[PDB]
Amino acid sequence: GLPTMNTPGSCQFLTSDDFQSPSAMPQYDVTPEMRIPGEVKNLMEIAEVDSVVPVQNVGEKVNSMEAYQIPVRSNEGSGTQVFGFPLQPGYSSVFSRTLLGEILNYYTHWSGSIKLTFMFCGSAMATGKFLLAYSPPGAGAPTKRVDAMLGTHVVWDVGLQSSCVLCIPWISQTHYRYVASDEYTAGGFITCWYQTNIVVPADAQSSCYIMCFVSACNDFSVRLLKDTPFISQENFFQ
Amino acid sequence: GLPTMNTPGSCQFLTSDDFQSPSAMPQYDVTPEMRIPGEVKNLMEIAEVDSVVPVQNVGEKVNSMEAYQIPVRSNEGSGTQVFGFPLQPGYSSVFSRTLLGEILNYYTHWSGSIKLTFMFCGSAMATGKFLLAYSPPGAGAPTKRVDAMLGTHVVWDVGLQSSCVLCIPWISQTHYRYVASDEYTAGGFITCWYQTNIVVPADAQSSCYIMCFVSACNDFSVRLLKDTPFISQENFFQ
Amino acid sequence: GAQVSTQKTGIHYTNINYYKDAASNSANRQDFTQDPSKFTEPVKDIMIKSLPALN
Amino acid sequence: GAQVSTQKTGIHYTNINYYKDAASNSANRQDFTQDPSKFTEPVKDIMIKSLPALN
Amino acid sequence: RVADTVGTGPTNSEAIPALTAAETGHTSQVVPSDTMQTRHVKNYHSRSESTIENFLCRSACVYFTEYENSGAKRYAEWVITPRQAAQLRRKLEFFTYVRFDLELTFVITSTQQPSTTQNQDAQILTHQIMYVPPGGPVPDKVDSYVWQTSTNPSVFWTEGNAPPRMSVPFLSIGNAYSNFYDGWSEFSRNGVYGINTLNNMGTLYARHVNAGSTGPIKSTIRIYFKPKHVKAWIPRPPRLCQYEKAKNVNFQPSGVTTTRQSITTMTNT
Amino acid sequence: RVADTVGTGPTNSEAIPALTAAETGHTSQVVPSDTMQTRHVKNYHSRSESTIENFLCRSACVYFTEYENSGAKRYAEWVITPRQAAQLRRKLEFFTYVRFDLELTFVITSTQQPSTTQNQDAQILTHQIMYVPPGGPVPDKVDSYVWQTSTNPSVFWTEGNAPPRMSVPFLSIGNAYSNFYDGWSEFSRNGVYGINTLNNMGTLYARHVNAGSTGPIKSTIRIYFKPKHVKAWIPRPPRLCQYEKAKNVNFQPSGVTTTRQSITTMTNT
Amino acid sequence: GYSDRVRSITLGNSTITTQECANVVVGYGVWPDYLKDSEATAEDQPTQPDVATCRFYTLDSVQWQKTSPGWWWKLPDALSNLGLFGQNMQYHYLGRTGYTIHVQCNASKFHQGCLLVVCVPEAEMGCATLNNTPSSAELLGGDTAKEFADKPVASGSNKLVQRVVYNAGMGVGVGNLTIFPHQWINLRTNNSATIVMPYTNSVPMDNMFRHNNVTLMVIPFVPLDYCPGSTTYVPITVTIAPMCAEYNGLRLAGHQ
Amino acid sequence: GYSDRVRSITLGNSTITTQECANVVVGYGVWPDYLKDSEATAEDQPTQPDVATCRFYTLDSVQWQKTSPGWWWKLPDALSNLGLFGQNMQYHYLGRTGYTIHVQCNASKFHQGCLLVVCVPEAEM
Numbered sequence A, B: 001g002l003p004t005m006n007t008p009g010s011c012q013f014l015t016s017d018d019f020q021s022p023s024a025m026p027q028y029d030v031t032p033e034m035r036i037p038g039e040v041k042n043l044m045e046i047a048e049v050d051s052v053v054p055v056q057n058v059g060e061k062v063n064s065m066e067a068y069q070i071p072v073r074s075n076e077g078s079g080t081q082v083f084g085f086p087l088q089p090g091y092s093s094v095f096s097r098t099l100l101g102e103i104l105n106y107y108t109h110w111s112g113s114i115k116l117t118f119m120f121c122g123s124a125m126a127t128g129k130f131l132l133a134y135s136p137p138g139a140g141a142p143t144k145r146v147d148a149m150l151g152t153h154v155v156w157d158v159g160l161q162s163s164c165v166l167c168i169p170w171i172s173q174t175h176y177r178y179v180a181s182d183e184y185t186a187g188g189f190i191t192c193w194y195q196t197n198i199v200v201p202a203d204a205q206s207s208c209y210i211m212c213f214v215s216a217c218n219d220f221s222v223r224l225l226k227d228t229p230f231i232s233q234e235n236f237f238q
Numbered sequence C, D: 001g002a003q004v005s006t007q008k009t010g011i012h013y014t015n016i017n018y019y020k021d022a023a024s025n026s027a028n029r030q031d032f033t034q035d036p037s038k039f040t041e042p043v044k045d046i047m048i049k050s051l052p053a054l055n
Numbered sequence E, F: 001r002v003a004d005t006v007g008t009g010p011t012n013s014e015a016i017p018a019l020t021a022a023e024t025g026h027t028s029q030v031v032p033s034d035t036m037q038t039r040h041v042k043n044y045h046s047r048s049e050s051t052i053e054n055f056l057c058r059s060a061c062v063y064f065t066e067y068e069n070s071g072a073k074r075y076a077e078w079v080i081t082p083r084q085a086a087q088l089r090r091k092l093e094f095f096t097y098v099r100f101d102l103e104l105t106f107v108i109t110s111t112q113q114p115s116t117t118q119n120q121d122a123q124i125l126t127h128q129i130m131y132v133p134p135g136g137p138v139p140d141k142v143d144s145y146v147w148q149t150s151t152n153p154s155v156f157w158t159e160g161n162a163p164p165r166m167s168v169p170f171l172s173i174g175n176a177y178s179n180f181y182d183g184w185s186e187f188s189r190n191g192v193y194g195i196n197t198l199n200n201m202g203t204l205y206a207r208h209v210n211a212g213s214t215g216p217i218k219s220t221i222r223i224y225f226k227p228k229h230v231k232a233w234i235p236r237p238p239r240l241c242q243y244e245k246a247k248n249v250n251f252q253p254s255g256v257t258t259t260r261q262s263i264t265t266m267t268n269t
Numbered sequence G: 001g002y003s004d005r006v007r008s009i010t011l012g013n014s015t016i017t018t019q020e021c022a023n024v025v026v027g028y029g030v031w032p033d034y035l036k037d038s039e040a041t042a043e044d045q046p047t048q049p050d051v052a053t054c055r056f057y058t059l060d061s062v063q064w065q066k067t068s069p070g071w072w073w074k075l076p077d078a079l080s081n082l083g084l085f086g087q088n089m090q091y092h093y094l095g096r097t098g099y100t101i102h103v104q105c106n107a108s109k110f111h112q113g114c115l116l117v118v119c120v121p122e123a124e125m126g127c128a129t130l131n132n133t134p135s136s137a138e139l140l141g142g143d144t145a146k147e148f149a150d151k152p153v154a155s156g157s158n159k160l161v162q163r164v165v166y167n168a169g170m171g172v173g174v175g176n177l178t179i180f181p182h183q184w185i186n187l188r189t190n191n192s193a194t195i196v197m198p199y200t201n202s203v204p205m206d207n208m209f210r211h212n213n214v215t216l217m218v219i220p221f222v223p224l225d226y227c228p229g230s231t232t233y234v235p236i237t238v239t240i241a242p243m244c245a246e247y248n249g250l251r252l253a254g255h256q
Numbered sequence H: 001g002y003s004d005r006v007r008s009i010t011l012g013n014s015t016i017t018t019q020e021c022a023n024v025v026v027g028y029g030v031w032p033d034y035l036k037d038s039e040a041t042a043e044d045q046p047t048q049p050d051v052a053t054c055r056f057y058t059l060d061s062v063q064w065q066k067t068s069p070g071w072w073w074k075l076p077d078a079l080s081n082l083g084l085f086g087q088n089m090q091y092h093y094l095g096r097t098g099y100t101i102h103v104q105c106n107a108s109k110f111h112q113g114c115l116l117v118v119c120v121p122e123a124e125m
């Protein structure tokens, strides 16, 4: 009869506890393992994979493959804005439903760099240069290419290498950021501008499309696990 | 099924217990530390720091910077009393709100020496000597400089070294004293007298000010933790 | 027959198991192994960053 | 994997931890380290007691 | 741990870490250091909380039913499936095949019921939860011989105590639990289509061993599942559309994301 | 330990340990031995109970609410803050930045309520306390799917048992918890001002898993916070004025101290 | 031939002399320096202007009167408009600095008074009206000293800072401000106060418009006085010099 | 797998790619650098902003027409209003810089034309 004494916490069921429980099926022989391809070991192996970003949310294109297409056209001037969305991988309607944004919605904090791979889907005869830029928060979003200028940019020349990767660094006051929005934890703006208008020959289409892909860099990490707001339920499914 | 037996104290919640509890957030990666300046390791590091003492509590000066000023003037005689307050660092209205007195109000016992650094804030042309004295309890407070005499004093000559430190020793029957008042645990009296009246030249102000600072010595320690009586509440703040 | 392992930090925690079945054991929270080049880069011919992908 | 440390006196008390997280551990009551010359004396040039402060 | 950034300076070469051909089906590995001047930063950040074990290993309620002291509903039964709850089902469905051990915790709670019954003075209720593997005899009443559990495992738990918990092995016939199944149960490509052709975990019955009082009492057993020692293969897109059935993929089409106005609008609408 | 006094004798030199210039911003280090003849005393006194861990590491009630068996208030919610209680808030505010682990103990207590309801015979009440980190779905009713806690952590506790307790890590984004913040949340120096721009710990919901009886019952959950493994930087003046708000420094001016009469009065009035 | 009273501080283009002083009070025992790769988060390479930013910026002089309650200057915002320190601060999302604060005030042998020169890390101030928070225009004063109040500010439906000096606008006891690095300018022995502040914050770098990490306060504890004839206009001049200023996150200019 | 046609120039925040080009023509065989103590006169210590000043400033685009004669941009004055290059330039009496001038113009296989891109030291007009 060993003298024991209980501490607060006895007979409590903590959802996230880690204890040993007696097996209900003793000496049960588990069917031997099999090497099945593509095993996941960490959720970041999945967030490091490019997934097409629905930049053109706009209207009913969200109910289509058009959400995925970024319209590019031959103008009568350069410096025009192609697109613009804020750096909120788990919050912005653009990123929230990406492979990266879905995983990020199960966590409260996040930290790291992100790769935005842009692929030009025009004719093999179309040319053009684009200014892909990321401007940290502090002063509003760049409204001219001349304001996007001063930011962290990458001039993309369309050629044989269809795609160009604008890599967004981690420039933050804090170590992590909230997955949900908070202006303390503000992220910045990603904009695209024509550097030199789209030039096409005669008989080739002048309006093309670009596609954007989002993946995490080797320094990306998510913290504090919570439930996604993306899956609801009214009754047990039957 | 190991034979155990509970002792009184089981399933009890002691406010000051020290036990292990299961983490609600497993394998959670804490944001790395940063060296931030001025780390406190013990509360006595704070009580060893001089803080201005409101000697002139008197009336509505307590609602002003005047609580902090000790009036000194050019008399027509010496031996006059400048001030007087008892040795009760946590209790006396003088010390109770000091850096030392606020910390002392979270503890029940206290022991040690105290430094009362007096700084002369007159004109550079004013002179004067003061008898800073501490008289242990037993016979009332000294009512004349001739009674303060016999105590533990320090004659302060005002000069280039603006300030003078009257250090109060620990002269007690007991090892500690109560922070709250108790005549068993009586402390003593601190008084100041003119040794040689304040002499000023023509065209220089004859009425100056002195400031008192309170800090603990290297032998000061506080014991038995309790709540300060200084912070009340009627409802949860919103 | 105990096992002292490391705690999650930014010490040790001794562990003994009492059950005859491995299914009765605690979760495996400390396996930070990882390999994204199954999904990122499942290409047959190697792709070097600094070089043109299509040559 | 236990740790025998000293009790507060004027003996020892053996301790083992059961949890995988350092946050699940007991408080650190026995750290009597101290350094008031961050606050008392944060002056650039050293000030010796027996000497005149202003010379 | 996470990778530290390397200190980078200017560049003027024919090396193009930024230009690629995404058609290859290969994700680019560009890092900040490649398209800008970086400073050296030491990353102590850890991807510990995103391991598959930490993601899935948390007790989730998968279902719950009620049984009573008297009447018709005197015992309950549930054919085991993790698909009746939106929350846990969706996490498991990030992977095509998952393999794991389970930790079962049950939260049994009773409520006194409205009656005209006078002088009620309940006695402590003890419950019995019984598992009937696929093939064994099923309780047809609160008192059929079946509740002897001579070979079936079952938990007897008296109210007011800590929640009954036990763990279970990887009970599958396959070398991994199949989360999806693009097939039928009949070789004639007929019968059932989908994962239900695979679900055969048996039923779980619960009952009051004793009625306890003269008045009515209704109990509600909540079953919690916690995947311990998890292995997951072949990842897939998280569920977009809401779940409609507990036995099939049936969804009602929904748009790719929410909307905003112009492709230039820095704000969700 | 505390420093022992050195035996001192008379003195007649130009060494002045007592005269200084307090303008330097340096606290004098005079000790009794310097301004009098001291005896040797051996100090065994220890500053153990005044370490920051011993000061802060004691369970304090930080808040408490109520929920019921029936009606509207069937579940509770509290946005986490240590600033609603005067006592613990003031101790933490002795420092500008604090970093620590937490130990949460909850004291859940129920009281039978007045009713005309006859034949009450309550069953044991089990409670569920759930944490919703900033961003997760929030319970809109005692029965929304949200209470499945498939990923959110939550405690299920049956009445009459020992108080539910668990510890939590240093959940901040910063390398230390900021107790004060002289700034805004918007770069346009607008929006929120102060510490609330920083508080984003999420909400805490509690509910009765079961109603238990026919009569009314109201419960009161008391949340206790205990800073374990504490680190505190940049100390400051203890709070003088009383607290007015739970989100800001707002105080109503009060005098430096209490009063007495003449500077010569050896007694408080 | 030396003197504890003499001094000379050279930072960039500027040099500062003192013929009567106390020591230089160094922050929390910490001398300012740059951010380490170990403590860094922002991966982009910083701009460290050096001689252009870390130099002596002398803001406006203020008059010490027999009735002045005190003054306060927020820190990043004071030099936010001064030279290249203010420029880099606008073009950059993140910034980090330490300072050498030199408060100057000279009177004569027939004048008396004593000022407390403190450096309050995170001086979060209160509002007159308990429900509101002070306005940005009420808390901040670029290079122009904001001043404390002699008596309680009225709690209408304002966003006025509760300036009564004795509570320091923070609801504390003004006499305990002595914990924060400080010095005194007792006109009897002093001439100036020098405080070298290291970077104090819970994050490695922060935005310089949204958050003012330190607040300088000059509060006279013993009032200015002098007999007639003794010169009446006694000004106080504040000279601050950034130290080890780095800037990460370059973009267009401003704050919004 | 290489090509004389591909390029990538990284300066500060900015990176520049080219999928069709010639070599980089380096000034007079000289690559820009800082002033030596041997060649210096101004005794005060310089500000070298680095990543803040030495980065890619993309000025306004101009239209090449079948009738355009040519264009010209003076050099310190062009970037005199751009970012921190323009700021340091205003607060300072003396300054010294070199440049990486990238002129961009893409047409198609059915377009023709040829521009001379020169850098005229001291184009006194």
Ligand SMILES: CCCCCCCCCCCCCCCC(=O)O
Binding pocket: A024, E080, E081, E082, E102, E104, E129, E130, E131, E153, E154, E155, E168, E171, E177, E178, E195, E198, E199, E200, E201, E204
């Ligand atoms: C009292 C003993 C209770 C035993 C509980 C046994 C529960 C079996 C759990 C099977 C787990 C998840 C499997 C999904 C099955 C499938 O679709 O293939």
Ligand SMILES: CCCCCCCCCCCCCCCC(=O)O
Binding pocket: B024, F080, F081, F082, F102, F104, F129, F130, F131, F153, F154, F155, F168, F171, F177, F178, F195, F198, F199, F200, F201, F204
């Ligand atoms: C059932 C799980 C409960 C989890 C309890 C989580 C409580 C979080 C405590 C945060 C602590 C004190 C922080 C003040 C925050 C701030 O102002 O920055």
Ligand SMILES: *C(=O)CCCCCCCCCCCCC
Binding pocket: C001, C002, C016, C017, C018, C019
């Ligand atoms: C290896 O374990 C030898 C040391 C044993 C330490 C005492 C074990 C404590 C109780 C264990 C009994 C196991 C329960 C089935």
Ligand SMILES: *C(=O)CCCCCCCCCCCCC
Binding pocket: C002, C014, C015, C016, D001, D002, D016, D017, D018, D019
């Ligand atoms: C080092 O600890 C070896 C000695 C083990 C002594 C027996 C341990 C007593 C019970 C510990 C089990 C740990 C609980 C998770």
